[model samples]
Target chain A: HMRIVEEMVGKEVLDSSAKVIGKVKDVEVDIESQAIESLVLGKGKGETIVPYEMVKKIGDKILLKGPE
Target chain B: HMRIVEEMVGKEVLDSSAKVIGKVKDVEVDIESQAIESLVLGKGGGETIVPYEMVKKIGDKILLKGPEE
Candidate 1:
Protein backbone atom coordinates (compact mmCIF):
# COMPACT_ATOMS: atom_id res chain seq x y z
CA HIS A 1 0.00 0.00 0.00
CA MET A 2 3.03 2.24 0.22
CA ARG A 3 1.80 4.70 2.79
CA ILE A 4 -0.75 5.31 0.01
CA VAL A 5 -4.07 3.65 -0.65
CA GLU A 6 -6.87 5.44 -2.50
CA GLU A 7 -9.64 3.78 -0.46
CA MET A 8 -12.40 4.20 -3.06
CA VAL A 9 -12.05 4.52 -6.84
CA GLY A 10 -13.20 2.46 -9.80
CA LYS A 11 -14.96 0.15 -7.33
CA GLU A 12 -17.98 -1.26 -9.18
CA VAL A 13 -21.03 0.25 -7.57
CA LEU A 14 -24.48 -1.21 -8.35
CA ASP A 15 -27.87 0.30 -7.76
CA SER A 16 -30.19 -2.53 -6.68
CA SER A 17 -28.49 -4.46 -9.47
CA ALA A 18 -30.73 -2.58 -11.84
CA LYS A 19 -27.92 -0.49 -13.26
CA VAL A 20 -24.30 0.26 -12.54
CA ILE A 21 -24.09 3.43 -10.49
CA GLY A 22 -20.90 4.63 -12.14
CA LYS A 23 -17.52 3.70 -10.74
CA VAL A 24 -16.59 5.28 -7.42
CA LYS A 25 -15.10 8.74 -8.02
CA ASP A 26 -12.85 8.12 -5.07
CA VAL A 27 -12.70 7.85 -1.31
CA GLU A 28 -12.67 11.23 0.32
CA VAL A 29 -9.29 11.09 2.03
CA ASP A 30 -8.02 13.56 4.59
CA ILE A 31 -4.99 15.26 3.00
CA GLU A 32 -3.13 15.30 6.28
CA SER A 33 -3.58 11.85 7.84
CA GLN A 34 -5.08 9.90 4.87
CA ALA A 35 -8.14 9.01 6.88
CA ILE A 36 -11.16 8.26 4.65
CA GLU A 37 -13.80 10.95 4.75
CA SER A 38 -16.32 9.73 2.16
CA LEU A 39 -16.89 7.77 -1.07
CA VAL A 40 -16.84 10.04 -4.13
CA LEU A 41 -18.95 8.41 -6.81
CA GLY A 42 -18.28 9.63 -10.37
CA LYS A 43 -20.63 11.80 -12.41
CA GLY A 44 -23.36 10.40 -14.62
CA LYS A 45 -26.92 11.00 -13.54
CA GLY A 46 -25.55 12.23 -10.26
CA GLU A 47 -22.53 12.07 -7.96
CA THR A 48 -22.71 9.99 -4.83
CA ILE A 49 -20.93 10.86 -1.62
CA VAL A 50 -21.23 7.85 0.65
CA PRO A 51 -19.48 8.50 3.92
CA TYR A 52 -16.90 6.07 5.27
CA GLU A 53 -19.38 4.66 7.77
CA MET A 54 -21.77 3.66 4.94
CA VAL A 55 -19.11 1.80 3.00
CA LYS A 56 -18.41 -1.89 3.46
CA LYS A 57 -15.40 -2.92 1.32
CA ILE A 58 -13.15 -2.05 -1.67
CA GLY A 59 -12.31 -5.37 -3.23
CA ASP A 60 -13.60 -6.52 -6.67
CA LYS A 61 -16.26 -3.88 -6.30
CA ILE A 62 -17.66 -1.39 -3.85
CA LEU A 63 -19.78 -3.09 -1.25
CA LEU A 64 -21.94 -0.29 0.09
CA LYS A 65 -25.09 -0.30 2.24
CA GLY A 66 -28.04 1.62 0.86
CA PRO A 67 -30.51 3.50 3.08
CA GLU A 68 -32.17 0.85 5.24
CA HIS B 1 2.36 12.94 -4.40
CA MET B 2 -0.56 13.93 -2.19
CA ARG B 3 0.66 17.42 -1.51
CA ILE B 4 1.49 19.68 -4.48
CA VAL B 5 0.82 16.85 -6.91
CA GLU B 6 -2.61 15.82 -5.66
CA GLU B 7 -3.82 15.99 -9.28
CA MET B 8 -2.82 12.31 -9.59
CA VAL B 9 -2.55 9.61 -6.98
CA GLY B 10 -1.07 6.08 -7.09
CA LYS B 11 -0.47 4.05 -10.31
CA GLU B 12 -0.19 0.35 -11.43
CA VAL B 13 -3.70 -1.16 -11.52
CA LEU B 14 -5.74 -3.89 -13.42
CA ASP B 15 -9.01 -5.96 -13.86
CA SER B 16 -6.84 -8.41 -12.21
CA SER B 17 -3.91 -5.42 -12.69
CA ALA B 18 -5.45 -4.00 -9.57
CA LYS B 19 -5.88 -7.12 -7.52
CA VAL B 20 -8.19 -4.17 -6.59
CA ILE B 21 -9.96 -1.10 -8.09
CA GLY B 22 -11.23 1.78 -5.94
CA LYS B 23 -12.24 5.31 -7.05
CA VAL B 24 -9.45 7.74 -6.32
CA LYS B 25 -10.01 8.49 -2.65
CA ASP B 26 -7.77 11.55 -2.92
CA VAL B 27 -6.67 14.13 -5.51
CA GLU B 28 -4.77 17.44 -6.14
CA VAL B 29 -7.49 19.25 -4.24
CA ASP B 30 -11.15 20.15 -4.53
CA ILE B 31 -12.93 16.82 -3.97
CA GLU B 32 -15.78 18.01 -6.22
CA SER B 33 -13.92 17.83 -9.49
CA GLN B 34 -13.94 14.95 -12.05
CA ALA B 35 -10.82 16.05 -13.88
CA ILE B 36 -9.60 12.46 -13.90
CA GLU B 37 -10.33 10.41 -10.82
CA SER B 38 -8.25 7.24 -11.32
CA LEU B 39 -7.44 3.80 -9.83
CA VAL B 40 -4.30 2.41 -8.15
CA LEU B 41 -2.88 -1.11 -8.30
CA GLY B 42 -0.43 -3.03 -6.19
CA LYS B 43 3.29 -3.74 -6.79
CA GLY B 44 2.45 -6.62 -9.14
CA GLY B 45 -0.86 -7.39 -10.92
CA GLY B 46 0.17 -5.88 -14.31
CA GLU B 47 -1.07 -2.83 -16.36
CA THR B 48 -3.61 -0.12 -15.51
CA ILE B 49 -5.17 3.33 -16.40
CA VAL B 50 -4.38 5.59 -19.42
CA PRO B 51 -3.55 9.31 -19.59
CA TYR B 52 -6.34 11.33 -21.06
CA GLU B 53 -5.28 15.02 -21.26
CA MET B 54 -1.55 15.52 -21.79
CA VAL B 55 0.49 16.37 -18.73
CA LYS B 56 4.02 17.62 -18.17
CA LYS B 57 6.57 14.86 -17.56
CA ILE B 58 8.26 15.52 -14.28
CA GLY B 59 9.84 12.81 -12.15
CA ASP B 60 8.20 9.35 -11.81
CA LYS B 61 7.62 5.96 -13.43
CA ILE B 62 6.06 5.37 -16.87
CA LEU B 63 2.22 5.32 -16.91
CA LEU B 64 0.48 2.00 -17.62
CA LYS B 65 -2.94 0.74 -18.70
CA GLY B 66 -5.38 -2.07 -17.95
CA PRO B 67 -8.87 -2.86 -19.34
CA GLU B 68 -9.79 0.79 -18.80
CA GLU B 69 -11.08 1.15 -22.42
Candidate 2:
Protein backbone atom coordinates (compact mmCIF):
# COMPACT_ATOMS: atom_id res chain seq x y z
CA HIS A 1 0.00 0.00 0.00
CA MET A 2 1.08 3.58 -0.69
CA ARG A 3 1.67 6.00 2.16
CA ILE A 4 1.12 9.73 1.99
CA VAL A 5 4.20 11.91 1.95
CA GLU A 6 2.58 14.28 4.38
CA GLU A 7 2.18 11.50 6.95
CA MET A 8 5.57 10.09 6.19
CA VAL A 9 7.34 13.42 6.59
CA GLY A 10 7.16 13.52 10.35
CA LYS A 11 7.64 9.81 10.99
CA GLU A 12 10.73 8.72 12.89
CA VAL A 13 13.34 6.88 10.90
CA LEU A 14 14.86 3.74 12.34
CA ASP A 15 18.07 2.02 11.55
CA SER A 16 18.59 -1.74 11.15
CA SER A 17 18.92 -1.98 14.91
CA ALA A 18 15.74 0.02 15.39
CA LYS A 19 17.63 3.05 16.62
CA VAL A 20 16.06 6.40 15.93
CA ILE A 21 18.12 8.31 13.43
CA GLY A 22 15.90 11.28 12.69
CA LYS A 23 12.52 12.38 11.44
CA VAL A 24 11.57 12.49 7.78
CA LYS A 25 11.73 16.07 6.60
CA ASP A 26 10.98 15.82 2.91
CA VAL A 27 10.88 13.53 -0.10
CA GLU A 28 12.67 13.99 -3.38
CA VAL A 29 11.04 12.74 -6.54
CA ASP A 30 12.36 12.38 -10.07
CA ILE A 31 9.54 13.98 -12.02
CA GLU A 32 10.50 12.44 -15.36
CA SER A 33 10.18 8.88 -14.04
CA GLN A 34 7.70 9.71 -11.30
CA ALA A 35 9.95 7.82 -8.90
CA ILE A 36 11.17 8.65 -5.42
CA GLU A 37 14.83 9.53 -5.44
CA SER A 38 15.56 9.89 -1.75
CA LEU A 39 14.17 10.82 1.66
CA VAL A 40 15.36 13.95 3.37
CA LEU A 41 15.81 13.74 7.09
CA GLY A 42 16.21 16.71 9.39
CA LYS A 43 16.00 20.27 8.15
CA GLY A 44 18.04 22.88 6.37
CA LYS A 45 21.80 22.71 6.84
CA GLY A 46 21.80 19.60 9.03
CA GLU A 47 19.84 17.28 6.74
CA THR A 48 20.49 13.66 5.89
CA ILE A 49 19.60 12.25 2.51
CA VAL A 50 18.75 8.56 2.34
CA PRO A 51 18.52 6.92 -1.04
CA TYR A 52 15.26 5.10 -1.75
CA GLU A 53 17.17 1.83 -2.13
CA MET A 54 18.33 2.15 1.47
CA VAL A 55 14.80 1.86 2.74
CA LYS A 56 13.90 -1.52 4.15
CA LYS A 57 10.30 -0.85 5.01
CA ILE A 58 7.79 1.95 5.52
CA GLY A 59 4.81 1.53 7.78
CA ASP A 60 4.19 3.44 10.96
CA LYS A 61 7.83 4.45 10.71
CA ILE A 62 10.60 4.42 8.15
CA LEU A 63 13.14 1.58 8.47
CA LEU A 64 16.52 1.69 6.87
CA LYS A 65 18.61 -1.25 5.74
CA GLY A 66 21.54 0.07 7.74
CA PRO A 67 22.46 2.77 10.18
CA GLU A 68 22.34 6.04 8.29
CA HIS B 1 -6.68 7.30 3.79
CA MET B 2 -3.11 8.50 3.46
CA ARG B 3 -1.51 8.97 0.09
CA ILE B 4 2.18 8.82 -0.65
CA VAL B 5 3.73 12.16 -1.55
CA GLU B 6 5.87 10.47 -4.16
CA GLU B 7 2.86 8.97 -5.92
CA MET B 8 0.94 12.22 -5.65
CA VAL B 9 3.67 14.47 -6.98
CA GLY B 10 3.10 13.60 -10.61
CA LYS B 11 -0.69 13.37 -10.65
CA GLU B 12 -2.64 15.73 -12.84
CA VAL B 13 -4.78 18.28 -11.05
CA LEU B 14 -8.26 19.19 -12.29
CA ASP B 15 -10.76 21.85 -11.38
CA SER B 16 -14.47 21.40 -10.51
CA SER B 17 -15.29 22.06 -14.14
CA ALA B 18 -13.07 19.15 -15.19
CA LYS B 19 -10.45 21.41 -16.63
CA VAL B 20 -6.84 20.35 -16.51
CA ILE B 21 -4.77 22.69 -14.43
CA GLY B 22 -1.32 21.21 -13.99
CA LYS B 23 0.71 18.35 -12.59
CA VAL B 24 1.58 18.10 -8.94
CA LYS B 25 5.13 19.26 -8.35
CA ASP B 26 5.44 18.83 -4.63
CA VAL B 27 3.68 18.84 -1.24
CA GLU B 28 4.32 20.97 1.78
CA VAL B 29 3.75 19.58 5.27
CA ASP B 30 3.48 21.34 8.57
CA ILE B 31 5.83 19.30 10.76
CA GLU B 32 4.56 20.53 14.08
CA SER B 33 1.02 19.36 13.43
CA GLN B 34 1.89 16.60 10.97
CA ALA B 35 -0.59 18.01 8.50
CA ILE B 36 -0.46 18.81 4.83
CA GLU B 37 -0.16 22.50 4.09
CA SER B 38 -0.58 22.68 0.33
CA LEU B 39 0.06 21.11 -3.04
CA VAL B 40 2.59 22.61 -5.40
CA LEU B 41 1.67 22.46 -9.06
CA GLY B 42 3.95 23.21 -11.97
CA LYS B 43 7.63 24.05 -11.52
CA GLY B 44 9.94 26.98 -10.94
CA GLY B 45 8.41 30.41 -11.47
CA GLY B 46 5.19 28.96 -12.85
CA GLU B 47 4.36 27.05 -9.66
CA THR B 48 0.91 27.32 -8.13
CA ILE B 49 0.23 26.62 -4.50
CA VAL B 50 -3.15 25.03 -3.77
CA PRO B 51 -4.21 24.82 -0.17
CA TYR B 52 -4.95 21.35 1.15
CA GLU B 53 -8.51 22.34 2.00
CA MET B 54 -9.18 23.10 -1.65
CA VAL B 55 -8.69 19.51 -2.67
CA LYS B 56 -11.92 17.62 -3.31
CA LYS B 57 -10.44 14.17 -3.88
CA ILE B 58 -7.28 12.18 -4.54
CA GLY B 59 -7.15 9.26 -6.91
CA ASP B 60 -5.67 8.86 -10.37
CA LYS B 61 -5.98 12.63 -10.50
CA ILE B 62 -6.35 15.48 -8.02
CA LEU B 63 -9.72 17.24 -7.99
CA LEU B 64 -10.04 20.75 -6.66
CA LYS B 65 -13.15 22.50 -5.33
CA GLY B 66 -12.58 25.46 -7.62
CA PRO B 67 -10.29 26.88 -10.25
CA GLU B 68 -7.07 28.28 -8.86
CA GLU B 69 -6.03 31.85 -9.41
Top DockQ hit: 2
For candidate 2, lDDT tens digit of each residue in B1-69?
A: 333454676789998999878888767654444345677788535978777778787778988886553
Per-prediction DockQ: 0.04, 0.10
Off by over 4 Å in 2: A66-68, B1-69
What 10-residue stretch in candidate 2 chain A is worst by lDDT?
A28-37
For residue A28, model 2's alpha carbon misses the true position, in angstroms, by 0.2
How accurate locally, in lDDT, is each candidate?
Answer: 0.42, 0.69
Candidate 1: TM-score, chain B only? 0.19
Error of 2 at A2 (Å): 1.4
